[PDB]
Symmetry: D2
Subunit: 288 residues, 4 copies
């Protein structure tokens, strides 16, 4: 059974000063922290074991999914019984969230290495927590990470989620080289390299690396022999030269909340459809 | 020299689950927590001393204005020199932020009482931290709290900020009785009562209490003997104060944001977003398209 | 390779008020928190992976073994290079400490359950962190937990550590029933029950459970089916284990310190203090100037 | 009324590794943190408003004196009501503890400067929290800080607490020069200088600065302009105003030192209200 490794040790300098004293993983998209969406997506894909690679400053992430004793007591002695029920059920009872401290800010590959002791010599999932997959645009129990797991476990081919971006934008992202295949949503095709921010004329595709990975167990020795130049990207490049890696075409839409503007867009997008405030918020937005 | 008392102990249940493990005072309006706007408003009005009446779960509030040692080191190391200069300047060098624990959620009046040791036998300011005064609609160095302070200095009359609301919504609010006189924005006038959630046709005005106060030192002994109401209510202590000296309503200029409620927070997010100093142009065009 | 599960969620009401706002695991025996002694015992026995079953209030435990960034920078700036090197070596580079939250104060059996997903369907170690095994009275590389392991590695019978107490004291502890067989130090024998705080006339031995376990994987389904009372006790589950396969009591060597008990904690402070590597000489001389 | 300024921002390098992730102020002397003895000493001397000058890592100090919600509920549900009553009494009901962050480890005098907003243009108390005054050797409602206060009220002279150390130890301490006056316990006298760690021969007395002060308001402008050491601004106060040494009665415990912390533990252990006799008997046999 695949565990999801989630690096949550970054200090979030791109969202300052909001993140000066609260984790970037706890920024609310309307009324829910980023990390709750990530954990929900995990649960929907069938993952029951989540490994947080974390930081001394990030206690609030674990508190969010743990019992908040004084909060429940207050909810009880105010008979907010539906609210109490939801709070108690943020984390499903069969989901175990475990945490290990990174120790030093040594990059995403080092972060993954911190999780080796929980994962073992096994394949695993990596989810970058600043990117949300919008579950109003895809059934996350059947698509995206769920389908990547299925494809990985049927074929043994590592799966790296990609999404098309407009050809003018290829310079912002890591770009998959799929050899000019007409890759359609939900499909997988062999990927030979990821190019880090190419020109519009150096770009091998319009497929941008999203931040979801299902990684074969053979990445582990590569990751250990990976220079301090420590980048998960580089060990992945090392994995391609010995076994096939596939790009997986994301379905629906995603939100990069690692970026102030992307986060603001996600806030409004989730807000218009909010279960209790969506109608009033939408109407007010139109009158503006 | 007036200190600003800011109650920040509430567990923020209207904003759950976002506030389950972070303070409501730290919810970001775009890229700045609510409490940072509150403190900026203080600074604009020349207040230099801020008293937080807080709670064991609210360390992040104090951490936001204190030196963040490892963050500053990371910004240095990565030579993000402009960012490092910005976070160092979140709290002006001449501003002091003090903290006392409330201990139990016994009401706004009790929260204010917890600050008495730091205020002393002196007048003081109360700001409720979930309400923002939009500084694109008013110059907070001269209007609102700044003007409330100037008026209080001139007269010794406590100032209670009010703002007009549609006559059909008055029951949601504390509502000021000012003897049915005309009150213009930025002006103060005698207030003889606050009615807690009046009916539509019983309401003595459409002037709703906003959550900004400049209060006379004489409220202290009144607050100290204010009975449970099951909370010690600041409004009850102010009622006592009106029985022995004049209290005035002050007419807010500009607009306010009630971020204690999910919808109001969401509106504030967008409203500050469209004029954001780096993202506003792109965000506005995105909203339009 | 066995992992060590360490329950650290309890509020430690026996050490109040010291433990009102710091974990009982962080109470210092001289100059070192209890938990650091526990991890060093782990390291001595070759354990490399340690699982903390914890609570929202216990961040200091994890902070202690993690990088303390501002403190390292302050030790550098004040040219305290020996101290800097020392706190950087509190957790060996080959040791991983991972943490799970227990969620509800539902007993030691539930705490152990909380670690199930990290142990897997494997044997594992439990260590109660309020009990120290004194490494001036035994070599923890070869004795006690390390000997329990090598035994389990050979027998596959679960190992529960016990130590003999005076007859006058058996009513304070949980007593093991090894059935008339008399147990020697460093030795293991078959065991059939534990009796909580028995009378003298019902005491099946003088062998008190210490708080170290090497447990077979077959305890896992039994743990999952143990009933409450509203706490799930690990003992009730070891009971069920002592039917599918044999469970053995291990006779601790040397001496232990029960630091969950105020007086026991105070005694440990003095005992480690007289031999402290830098203060023990002066502390000893000061102690004997008093007294005499 | 005098407020007590307690600097609690230091990272306690001398008690490592115990203090790596917990405040030195929370080190337990038997079963109570250092800081709880300090607060008890304040309340006994009649001080009811305490100013902690603190650090982001020191939340546990405020939590000790605040309501511990889950812990109180656990005690209630387990009907350990005697214990519940006792932890509800750690902070007297009329004692207010306030906190301000130091921000940069700029020294003890800077730390006092952080408390000016709270203190005002007023005299005030400083208490160094690693030093305990043993209340089995002195009635702290009538001696020591209490009497230091009464003396300051009558005179307007700042009071520096001092105690006789072995003449051979004088290099570890700040030493009060009392101008060849032979101070007796409980008495004050003028201080002609305060020397930092003098030689045995150069030392002007065997009276060492303890870590309790009652300071006149006039140190405030002096504190603001200081090259950042409290004793330098103390030195400047004496350049314009008389400052007095006050002879401590009883004994004190310097728990900023490892050995001092161990000695305090044992000394308080032997007189512990429920474990003292068992511990004392057992200690007798351990050497």
């Amino acid at each position: 059974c695949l565990k999801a490794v989630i690096p949550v040790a970054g200090l979030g300098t791109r969202m300052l000063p909001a993140t000066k004293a609260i984790p970037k993983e706890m920024l609310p998209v309307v009324d829910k922290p980023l990390i709750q969406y990530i954990v929900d997506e995990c649960v929907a894909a069938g993952v029951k074991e989540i490994v947080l690679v974390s930081h001394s400053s990030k206690n609030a992430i674990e508190n969010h999914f743990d019992t908040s004793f004084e909060l429940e007591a207050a909810l009880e002695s105010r008979v907010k019984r539906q609210l109490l029920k939801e709070i108690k059920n943020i984390c499903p009872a069969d989901v175990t969230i475990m945490q290990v401290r990174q120790g030093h800010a040594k990059g995403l590959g080092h972060a993954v290495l911190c999780a080796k002791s929980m994962v073992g010599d096994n394949p695993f999932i990596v989810m970058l927590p600043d990117v949300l997959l919008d579950d109003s645009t895809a059934d996350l129990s059947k698509e995206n990470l769920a389908s990547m797991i299925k494809r990985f476990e049927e074929t043994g081919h590592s799966q790296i989620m990609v999404e098309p971006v407009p050809k003018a934008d290829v310079s912002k992202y890591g770009i998959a080289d799929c050899g000019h295949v007409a890759l359609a949503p939900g499909e997988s095709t062999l990927m030979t390299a990821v190019v880090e921010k190419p020109s519009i004329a150096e770009a091998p595709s319009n497929l941008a690396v999203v931040g979801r990975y299902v990684l074969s167990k053979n990445i582990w020795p590569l990751l250990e022999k990976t220079p301090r130049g420590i980048q998960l990207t580089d060990a992945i490049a090392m994995l391609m030269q010995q076994e096939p890696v596939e790009a997986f075409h994301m379905t629906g839409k995603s939100h990069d909340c690692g970026d102030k503007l992307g986060y603001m867009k996600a806030f409004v997008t989730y807000g218009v459809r909010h279960h209790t405030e969506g109608e009033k918020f939408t109407a007010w937005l139109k009158q503006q």
